[PDB]
């Protein structure tokens, strides 16, 4: 099936003729993809020779645990990541239960890529683009059921005072359709952008069933296009949540917000504010701010906060088929479906 519950329509490497391989380390993954580019005669095939399903059984807890004990020593180390560049035959990277990685997955100019059940945390190289997951010029990508974490903290003396750790899921370029679902993102200062600059506007992204906890900002930092965020659990947001910019449009439905500062805003540009359609969230009116500990702040430049909690624009017909659960149900159940080791389980109404 190609249904991801969002804009991305892909099965990744789970197609006809897929070759399954087991990777026990980051290097194995690199070698497997390289080999996957060669045809029967040893010649390279543009976009890849065959579809792949790579099961990653490696474990780097030692690296992660060492890093967690010395947070400020990570930004200056070499970044570590597997680059999936120009591979379009279809590929899925599934972590085995118990597997872990102290390296990121960088997708560049590829298509039909699915990343699931990977536990990635405390990556080194925040000063040199050490992102956990990067989707660049890559349409039909599905980032599902992963645990992305670090420390929601900024060490002193880091270059730009923003490089202690890099992003969890940055999306940029022509990654026209992307679905980010069932991820447990925690302890991340900059979760992920949707457009790397003011000119990098566009794309149709869906964020559904994600559990965010102790994050500072960018859920996402949207530049143009459309974003459909539904059934996400937003708790302990220390800076700002969805920042809808450059005239982007967002449909924010049936989510649960709690202990969040500026959960829905449009700030930092001073102009071209985006719009949002609010519906079915735990917060229905301003009276609820106090109940769920939702605070608001101003910005030095013109900005717009959803402090009136009203829709400020419209949203096109949601192309795909999805069935949202209630905000209460996500609050109650989501933590047991999002993340690694949940066997890619989905939250249905029957479980509410």
UniProtKB/Swiss-Prot annotation:
Gene3D superfamilies, per database record: Single-stranded right-handed beta-helix, Pectin lyase-like (2.160.20.10)
Disulfide bonds: 72-155, 329-352
Alphabetical keyword list: Calcium, Disulfide bond, Lyase, Metal-binding, Secreted, Signal, Virulence
Cofactor: Ca(2+)
Catalytic activity annotation: Eliminative cleavage of (1->4)-alpha-D-galacturonan to give oligosaccharides with 4-deoxy-alpha-D-galact-4-enuronosyl groups at their non-reducing ends
Top-level enzyme category: lyase
Active site residues of this protein: 218
InterPro entries in UniProt: Pec_lyase, Pectin_lyas_fold, Pectin_lyase_fold/virulence, PEL
A Pfam family that the UniProt record links to this protein: Pectate_lyase_4
Record's keyword annotation contains Iron: no
Primary location recorded for the protein, binned into one broad class: secreted
Associated pathway: Glycan metabolism; pectin degradation; 2-dehydro-3-deoxy-D-gluconate from pectin: step 2/5
Localisation per UniProt entry: Secreted
Highest taxon, organism lineage: Bacteria
Record family assignment: Belongs to the polysaccharide lyase 1 family. PLADES subfamily.
Protein name as it appears in the record: Pectate lyase C
Source organism of this protein record: Dickeya chrysanthemi (Pectobacterium chrysanthemi)
């Amino acid at each position: 099936a190609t249904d991801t519950g969002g804009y991305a329509a892909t099965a990744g490497g789970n197609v006809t003729g897929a070759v399954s391989k087991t990777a026990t380390s980051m290097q194995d993954i690199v070698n497997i993809i390289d080999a996957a580019r060669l045809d029967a005669n040893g010649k390279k095939v543009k976009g890849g020779a065959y579809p792949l399903v790579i099961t990653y059984t490696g474990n780097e807890d030692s690296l992660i645990n060492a890093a967690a004990a010395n947070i400020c020593g990570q930004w200056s180390k070499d970044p570590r990541g597997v680059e999936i560049k120009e591979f379009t035959k279809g590929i899925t990277i599934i972590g085995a239960n118990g597997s872990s990685a102290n390296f990121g997955i960088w997708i560049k100019k590829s298509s039909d890529v699915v990343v699931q059940n990977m536990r990635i945390g405390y990556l080194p190289g925040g000063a040199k683009d050490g992102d956990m997951i990067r989707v660049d010029d890559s349409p039909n990508v599905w980032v599902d059921h992963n645990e992305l974490f670090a420390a929601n903290h900024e060490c002193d003396g880091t270059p730009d005072n923003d490089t202690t750790f890099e992003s969890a899921v940055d999306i940029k370029g022509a990654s026209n359709t992307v679905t980010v679902s069932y991820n447990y993102i925690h302890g991340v200062k900059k979760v992920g952008l949707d457009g790397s600059s003011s000119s990098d506007t566009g794309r149709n992204i869906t964020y559904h069933h994600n559990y965010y906890n102790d994050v500072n900002a960018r859920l996402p930092l949207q530049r143009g296009g459309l974003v459909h965020a539904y059934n996400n659990l937003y708790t302990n947001i220390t800076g700002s949540g969805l920042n809808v910019r450059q005239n982007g449009q967002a449909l924010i439905e049936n989510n649960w917000f709690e202990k969040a500062i500026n959960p829905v805003t449009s700030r930092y540009d001073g102009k071209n504010f985006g719009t949002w359609v609010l519906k079915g969230n735990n917060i229905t009116k301003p009276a609820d701010f106090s109940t769920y500990s939702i605070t608001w702040t101003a910005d030095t430049k013109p900005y717009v906060n959803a402090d009136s909690w009203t829709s400020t624009g419209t949203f096109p017909t949601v192309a795909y088929n999805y069935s949202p659960v209630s905000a209460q149900c996500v609050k109650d159940k989501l933590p047991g479906y999002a993340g690694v080791g949940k066997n890619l389980a989905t939250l249905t109404s029957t479980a509410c």
